[PDB]
Amino acid sequence: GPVPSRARVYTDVNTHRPREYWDYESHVVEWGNQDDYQLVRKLGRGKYSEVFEAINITNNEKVVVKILKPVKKKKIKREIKILENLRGGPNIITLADIVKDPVSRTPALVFEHVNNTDFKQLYQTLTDYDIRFYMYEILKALDYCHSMGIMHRDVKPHNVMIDHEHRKLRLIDWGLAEFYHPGQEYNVRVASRYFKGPELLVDYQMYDYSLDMWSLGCMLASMIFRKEPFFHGHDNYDQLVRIAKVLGTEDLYDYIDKYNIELDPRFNDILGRHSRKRWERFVHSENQHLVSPEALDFLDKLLRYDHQSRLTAREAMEHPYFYTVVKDQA
Ligand SMILES: O=C(O)c1ccc2c(c1)nc(NCCCCCCCCNCc1ccc(-c3ccccc3)c(Cl)c1)c1ccncc12
CATH class of the missing domain: 1.10.510.10 (Transferase(Phosphotransferase) domain 1)
Structure with a gap:
């Protein structure tokens, strides 16, 4: 069979962490209410999700809701745990909230908004x-x-x-x-x-x-x-x-x-x-x-x-x- 390989940096980080850090299958998610947020428009779809501009009616601020296409509960837990673990990290997107529509009961994730720049202008005058x-x-x-x-x-x-x-x-x-x-x-x-x-x-x-x-x-x-x-x-x-x-x-x-x-x-x-x-x-x-x-x-x-x-x-x-x-x- 094939020869084994170790990462030569950060090889053992996870081992030295408490089990909760990486045992995401047992992470217990607390689902807020998707009515905190009002969908405004669709920002693009995908294989795993579809993403909407929404506004948070409480503080009136722009946000982004990624409604997860149906996938194994654990794959959702995984992404949440990883987002929770990386929060505040340099240039990592920030998970703001985790919600679930009341009727459809479909999970979604609420992200900070980023005034993205058109790649047509970002691929000619890029020095x-x-x-x-x-x-x-x-x-x-x-x-x-x-x-x-x-x-x-x-x-x-x-x-x-x-x-x-x-x-x-x-x-x-x-x-x-x-x-x-x-x-x-x-x-x-x-x-x-x-x-x-x-x-x-x-x-x-x-x-x-x-x-x-x-x-x-x-x-x-x-x-x-x-x-x-x-x-x-x-x-x-x-x-x-x-x-x-x-x-x-x-x-x-x-x-x-x-x-x-x-x-x-x-x-x-x-x-x-x-x-x-x-x-x-x-x-x-x-x-x-x-x-x-x-x-x-x-x-x-x-x-x-x-x-x-x-x-x-x-x-x-x-x-x-x-x-x-x-x-x-x-
Ligand atoms: O799923 C999640 O977690 C998530 C979280 C938050 C959001 C989210 C998904 N989706 C959103 N929109 C849906 C559609 C996707 C938008 C397309 C982006 C392509 C830009 N990329 C061009 C480029 C241009 C230049 C470079 C480059 C520069 C210098 C050197 C080398 C390369 C390089 Cl690399 C790349 C959204 C909108 C607003 N707010 C938050 C989100």
Whole structure:
């Protein structure tokens, strides 16, 4: 069978916590009344939820209600417990309240509101400084939650609210977030297709926070090369191929060989053989202002097959790519 792997940071946080911290299946939820809040309009639907603008009739303030599509009680407890545990954390969305309609009796979560900025204006006049700035904000969220023994597992653009006016970022949707436990084997059917780490794509279940670090690499990559998405795969299988055409096959097969992964027979014929491309092949006229030897160097240290060699959030935060935002924050 496959070789075991431990997270090399925050490995044992959860063990040293009281059982209540992570035993969310026994968390007892106290359901307020959904009539505290009046739905105003629908802000977008999803597979797991639908989200509405609402106002809280008591203090008259704008809020957001995420009405959860039917899923196992425990998956709801999980997301609540994780939100409860991470509250006040840098750039984590704030759970305000938890309610349940009186008639339909359907659970919902009430979140703080974020004056989100249109991505059409946030993907043309976004400067190389703004990309380093907000990326550093995401690492604040990632390093906090990882330090709190939590992996997010759905890092993707649609989950990062930015209030460009106030220069505020919030990491949202913890529906997929889970607790890290050394040795645990996890469901690899997680995150969105363009931000799956190779470990999900090859079915290696003993992964850790390093998964969140790949998804970040995908996003930085797509922003400095102005290619959305950067790895554009048709399915989960072709996604690995699109990755292999860029990182090379030789590292991929070493990764498989090192963890003694058993690769799918489907993959036995589509991966082929590909060299590792230098990042210079992706820089052109329109995007050269966002590319630099520091971004490239930081990017290359995030996108790695081997999850153990990916930078931790705290290492990322110390990378020279962020030297200016660190200095300006003082
Ligand atoms: O489920 C929950 O918990 C939850 C909690 C609260 C809310 C919630 C869900 N849903 C809400 N709306 C429903 C629809 C989703 C809105 C789409 C957001 C996409 C923005 N993303 C673009 C972007 C732009 C730039 C970058 C970037 C920048 C610098 C460097 C690299 C990248 C990067 Cl990464 C990304 C909502 C609305 C108001 N208030 C609260 C919420």
